[PDB]
């Protein structure tokens, strides 16, 4: 329409006239604020054979204060950009405004509890309050284009644009086709496309006003019961999807927006280690396979790395990490089986052009496997090949079953296996077997093994297939050229010529087999042996690999390696690698291109051996350095009291007035006499606190008070310095009633109410109309017991500043209102000199909170990637106790004792300092009139890697400085 760059017909995206299918993962650059760790996960991602990534931006951390766009430092979204470019990743932009996410507010700063208009809909002071955040976020999206020579090939406005309540007329075309025309306003050419949240048609081409130019749909069919992670529910997978997609827009690609690559874990739940284990290489080789069997051409697995819920930007439900059980660890490693199998369906798109232009059929349970008990859906091409997806009838089920197929070929339908035998599908698992599958040329008749790549070199080609253990399978060339073994043993081979074809039958194993046929050679491997293999472009004009054309797609080289492979490039004579190793690793580069004569790994020059075949080899030896960490519990720990509230001495006469009589609040009208919601007078985010000031008759008895901070807060409450109870909180809980007994008040002395309110973070507005992201924080309703309401007049305070928050460098959300964090103390070299000593493992031995900070020097060896853990001990049940700690100023842990489940925190580098002093400090609430204490307190690390990675630079971490706007 406004650009030939990115274009589109019924079957696949073209990005420059080529057809490309779209395989790409979900990354968050505000859940990981460090560039060089951005370029870190982006090539993680090139190395599945993707070729884009999807990102939100949170207008929450952008625009803190009302008509203060703020996109620099750590949330500049330019080096993220540049960073994709140089990985060769295309991006899918999606900067809200509403994004959802696990995000505090879904998105949403929290001033927009006081817009007087329904959230995502067409009243004026709604689609107002957004215009200065698109107008300037589009406009960067916009410069970044590929029509401008970016990496940025799609658009999606607003999320999950799919179920309305309360009045709004849904879907309302007037609100999309202005959330639309936005991002056109501001120079966004690239087609746009949404994600309805199930395949409702919402916004389709030919829906007319507010109509995308693709739809697209999300799906998490697997659910979110990470307790149960072998359970796989009947009925579960999805058969349907194509039927709906020719109804619902037939016209464009088939597009799955958000595919389940995780799931989000709750305060309270079992871990996203169990999250892993659902969402593991098993439902990926089943789930995933099945949205290939729907013809899928764009794919966007949320997430690929999830990062971390720092400073505070989570929902009131999640915890602080993200790791989402994804194919990217929180610390960035590629540990977890799923990743290395996601690589090899990423990898076998990447090379299968024919996948794109096949005619999909109905699933079968009849016809082309010799049993009910397997499902095949074919998607049937005459020249450009067919290709089938196996899998069990039940899709649950972990049986063996024996098979054998009937396929269509040029060369006329066959019975597989010809040679004899049957092919197995063990399991969970699911095959894509090709009929006439083009190799440079070369037509692979069948194959029943998968493939995993194929590249075609001056010297010849290569095909590198792959199945299970256990499992014989069959090929068959056209070709009169018989088979050779090149490598490996000659028994489990068989092999008959016929006048046009060679066949080959093969039984999977541990050790490879290379065969050749004429100028093919064809490795035959096991799964796992698998997972070792990479196929890097090769660049010849640059070191980088360039974004995924065909041409350099083409050009790529086959590695097997280790734990990663990066990049390839050939300069002059010699073939340079960039590559990690968390192990000694045999190297083997296939397809070596002529002119070069030496091998370079991460710059070193690294002796080889050329076998018989032309193989290059090399060794890269892994032997892990000393890593020395400081013991945490051993540090000159000071201490401040960081709730002087509570003292007789305490003046709050400069702490803003809770004094409103009618709230802006839309949604929840006061039951009280003036608004204590939080948003109201600017506080967002945080530790919450509420000064009572009343004259006593004498006859007080009980204090009642509803507090609101979202699931799994609480809070505390002083009167004067005497604790009268806390809320311990419970997940289950967003809000809590309490009845406080109350001492004995002397008649016409004045008194003051503390309450210390945990705000877990501003709801999500996931439905359209019922506006819950405007659900408030603090005190809903209050009673002093024979009073009126009036009796008190309350003040508070959140983050000091509020909307005018302190820290620009760290964002509006980082800091809460504690004393502490108001004066800034929470930064590097804080004001401690006088200050007591005494460690937070010593702690409180009444109710309260207490601040300790320390500082401690790291010394780690250049060159080697290694991922710091913070761990708070909970071996044995723990009295009740909230934990914030900042790393450098920056908080990278919320933790509460009796809810959990987090106790290990990442922290990445450039927020720690791996060649310098860090710092850290550490709030400590105790909800027991006991106190409390940390039971320990560690740093660790894993598996130190040897990495390509260049040095990773500090973030900005602005030091304590005296701030003028504080209470004192
Ligand atoms: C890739 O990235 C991943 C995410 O970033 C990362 O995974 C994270 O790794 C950290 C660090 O290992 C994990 O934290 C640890 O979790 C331990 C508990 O989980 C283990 O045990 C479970 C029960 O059997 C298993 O279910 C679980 O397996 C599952 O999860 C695995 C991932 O971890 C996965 O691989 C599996 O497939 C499976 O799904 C898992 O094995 C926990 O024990 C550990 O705490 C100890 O270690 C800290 C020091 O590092 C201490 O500070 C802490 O106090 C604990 O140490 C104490 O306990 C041990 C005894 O059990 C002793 O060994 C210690 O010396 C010490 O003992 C003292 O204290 C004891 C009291 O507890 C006492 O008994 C002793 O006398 C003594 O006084 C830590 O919390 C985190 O959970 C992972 N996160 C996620 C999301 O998975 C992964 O590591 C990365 N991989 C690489 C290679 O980089
Ligand atoms: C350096 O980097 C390397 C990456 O480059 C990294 O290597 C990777 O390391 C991870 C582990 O961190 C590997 O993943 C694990 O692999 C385990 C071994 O099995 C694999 O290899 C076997 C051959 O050696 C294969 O036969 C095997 O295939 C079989 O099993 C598959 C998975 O279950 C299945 O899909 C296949 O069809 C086939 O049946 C497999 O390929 C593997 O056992 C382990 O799986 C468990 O953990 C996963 C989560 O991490 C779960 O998703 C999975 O379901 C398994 O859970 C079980 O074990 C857990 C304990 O960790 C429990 O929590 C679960 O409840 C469950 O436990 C039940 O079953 C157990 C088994 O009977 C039993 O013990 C329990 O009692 C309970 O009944 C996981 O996938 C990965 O393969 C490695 N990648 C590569 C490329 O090599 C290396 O580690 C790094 N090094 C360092 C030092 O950091
Ligand atoms: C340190 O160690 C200590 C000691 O071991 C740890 O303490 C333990 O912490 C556990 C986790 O917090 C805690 O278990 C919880 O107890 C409560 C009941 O008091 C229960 O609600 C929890 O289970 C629900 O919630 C979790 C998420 O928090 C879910 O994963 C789980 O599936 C349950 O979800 C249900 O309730 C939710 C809230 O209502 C719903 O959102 C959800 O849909 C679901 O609701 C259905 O079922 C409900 C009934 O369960 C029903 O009411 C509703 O109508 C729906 O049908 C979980 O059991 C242990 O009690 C606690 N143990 C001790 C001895 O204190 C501590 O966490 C550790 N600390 C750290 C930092 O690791
Ligand atoms: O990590 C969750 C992820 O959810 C996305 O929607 C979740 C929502 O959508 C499904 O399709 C289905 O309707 C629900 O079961 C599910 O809750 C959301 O777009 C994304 O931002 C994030 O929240
Ligand atoms: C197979 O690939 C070759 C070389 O790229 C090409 O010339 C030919 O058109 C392809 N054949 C088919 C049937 O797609
Ligand atoms: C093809 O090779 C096989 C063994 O690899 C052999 O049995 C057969 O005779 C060969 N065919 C011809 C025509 O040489
Ligand atoms: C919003 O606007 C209407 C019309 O001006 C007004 O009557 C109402 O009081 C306002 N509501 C809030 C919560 O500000
Ligand atoms: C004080 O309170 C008690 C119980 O609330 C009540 O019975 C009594 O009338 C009150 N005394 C005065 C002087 O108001
Ligand atoms: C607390 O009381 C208020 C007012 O009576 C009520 O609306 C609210 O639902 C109650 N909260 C809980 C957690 O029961
Ligand atoms: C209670 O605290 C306030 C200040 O927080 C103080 O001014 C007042 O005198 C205290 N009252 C008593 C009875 O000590
Ligand atoms: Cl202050």
Redesign the pocket.
């Known amino acids: 329409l406004l650009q030939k760059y990115v274009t589109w017909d019924d079957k696949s995206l073209f990005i420059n006239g080529e057809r490309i299918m779209i395989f790409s993962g979900e990354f968050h650059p505000f859940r990981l604020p460090v560039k060089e760790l951005q370029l870190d996960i982006f090539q993680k991602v090139k190395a599945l054979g993707f070729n884009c990534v999807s990102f939100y931006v949170d207008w929450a951390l952008v625009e803190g204060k009302p008509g203060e766009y703020r996109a620099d430092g750590i949330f500049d979204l330019e080096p993220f950009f540049d960073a994709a470019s140089e990985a060769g990743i295309y991006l899918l932009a999606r900067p809200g405004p509403y994004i959802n996410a696990e995000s505090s507010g879904g998105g949403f700063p929290g001033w927009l509890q006081r817009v007087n208009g329904t959230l995502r809909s067409s009243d004026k002071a709604y689609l107002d309050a957004t215009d200065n955040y698109v107008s300037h976020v589009a406009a960067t999206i916009a410069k970044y284009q590929i029509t401008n020579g970016g990496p940025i090939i799609l658009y999606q406005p607003e999320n999950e644009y799919t179920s309305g309540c309360c009045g709004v007329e849904f879907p309302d075309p007037v609100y999309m086709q202005y959330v639309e025309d936005q991002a056109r306003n501001a120079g966004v050419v690239i087609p746009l496309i949404n994600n309805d949240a199930s395949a409702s048609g919402n916004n389709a081409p030919g829906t007319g006003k507010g109509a995308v130019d693709i739809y697209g749909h999300d799906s998490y069919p697997l659910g979110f ?3 149960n992670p072998t359970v796989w529910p009947s009925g579960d997978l999805p058969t349907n999807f194509r039927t709906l997609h020719l109804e619902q827009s037939p016209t464009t690609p088939y597009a799955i927006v958000q595919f389940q690559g995780g799931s989000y ?6 871990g996203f280690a169990a999250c892993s284990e659902l969402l593991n290489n098993e439902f990926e080789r089943v789930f995933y396979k099945n949205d290939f069997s729907f013809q899928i051409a764009i794919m966007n697995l949320y997430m690929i790395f999830g990062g971390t819920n720092w400073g505070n930007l989570g929902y009131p ?1 999640g915890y602080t990490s993200y790791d989402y059980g994804s194919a990217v660890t929180e610390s960035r490693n590629i540990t977890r089986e799923k990743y290395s199998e996601l690589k090899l369906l990423g990898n076998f798109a990447k090379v299968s052009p024919g996948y794109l232009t096949a005619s999909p059929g109905n699933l079968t349970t009849s016809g082309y496997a010799d049993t009910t008990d397997l499902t095949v859906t074919p998607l049937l091409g005459n020249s450009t090949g067919s290709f089938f997806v196996v899998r069990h009838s039940d899709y649950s089920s972990e049986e063996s079953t024996s098979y054998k197929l009937r396929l269509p070929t040029s060369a006329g339908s066959v019975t597989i296996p010809q040679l004899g035998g049957t092919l197995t599908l063990n399991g969970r698992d699911s095959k894509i077997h090709v009929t006439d599958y083009n190799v440079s040329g070369t037509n692979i008749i069948y194959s029943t093994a998968e493939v995993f790549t194929w590249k075609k070199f001056a010297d010849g080609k290569v095909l590198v297939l792959y199945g299970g253990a256990g499992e014989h399978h069959e090929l068959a060339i056209s070709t009169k050229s018989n088979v050779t073994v090149i490598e490996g043993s000659e028994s489990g081979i068989s092999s008959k010529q016929t006048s046009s074809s060679v066949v080959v039958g093969w039984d999977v194993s541990t050790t490879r087999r290379i065969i050749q046929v004429g100028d093919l050679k064809i490795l035959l491997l096991d799964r796992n042996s698998a997972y070792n293999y990479w196929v890097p472009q090769l660049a010849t004009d640059g070191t980088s690999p360039g974004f995924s054309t065909p041409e350099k797609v083409a050009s790529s080289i086959i590695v097997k390696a280790g734990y990663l492979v990066r990049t390839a490039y050939l300069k002059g004579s010699g073939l340079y690698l960039t590559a990690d190793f968390n192990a000694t690793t045999s190297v083997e580069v296939i397809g070596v291109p002529s002119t070069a004569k030496n091998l370079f790994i991460n710059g070193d020059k690294t002796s080889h051996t050329v076998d018989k075949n032309g193989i290059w080899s090399a060794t890269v030896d892994y032997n892990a350095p000393d890593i020395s960490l400081p013991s945490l519990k051993d540090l000159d720990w000071k201490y401040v009291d960081t709730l002087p509230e509570i003292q007789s001495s305490y003046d709050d006469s400069l702490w803003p007035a809770a004094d409103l009589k009618q709230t802006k609040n839309t949604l929840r009208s006061l039951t009280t006499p003036t608004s204590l919601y939080s948003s109201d007078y600017g506080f967002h985010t945080g530790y919450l606190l509420y000064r009572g000031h009343f004259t006593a008759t004498g006859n007080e008895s009980t204090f009642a008070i509803d507090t609101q901070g979202g ?2 807060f609480g809070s505390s409450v002083w009167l004067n310095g005497t604790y009268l109870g806390s809320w311990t909180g ?3 809980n967003s809000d809590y009633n309490a009845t406080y007994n109350l001492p004995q008040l002397q008649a016409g002395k004045t008194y003051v109410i503390t309450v210390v309110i945990d705000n877990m973070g501003l709801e999500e507005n996931w439905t359209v109309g019922e506006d819950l992201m405007k659900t408030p924080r603090g005190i809903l309703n209050f009673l002093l017991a024979g009073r009126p309401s009036s009796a008190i007049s309350w003040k508070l305070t959140g983050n000091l500043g509020g909307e005018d928050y302190e820290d620009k460098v760290r964002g509006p959300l980082n800091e809460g209102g504690l004393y502490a964090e108001r004066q800034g103390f929470h930064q590097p070299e804080p004001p401690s000199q006088n200050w007591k000593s005494s460690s937070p493992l010593e702690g409180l031995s009444e109710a309260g909170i207490g601040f300790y900070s320390a500082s401690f020097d790291l010394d780690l060896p250049k060159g080697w990637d290694v991922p710091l853990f913070l761990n ?1 001990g ?5 009295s009740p106790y909230r934990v914030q700690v900042y790393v450098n100023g920056y908080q990278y842990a919320k ?9 290990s925190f990442p922290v990445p580098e450039g927020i720690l300092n791996y060649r310098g002093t860090n710092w850290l400090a550490v709030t400590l609430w105790a909800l027991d009139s006991a106190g409390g204490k940390l039971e320990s307190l560690e740093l660790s690390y894993t598996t130190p890697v040897l990495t390509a990675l260049g040095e990773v630079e500090s973030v900005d971490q602005p030091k304590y400085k005296k701030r003028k706007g504080a209470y004192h």
């Open positions: 019961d990470c307790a874990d709750p305060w309270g739940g079992p439900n699931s799994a419970l997940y289950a708070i909970n071996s044995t049940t723990p933790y509460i004792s009796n809810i959990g489940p987090q106790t």
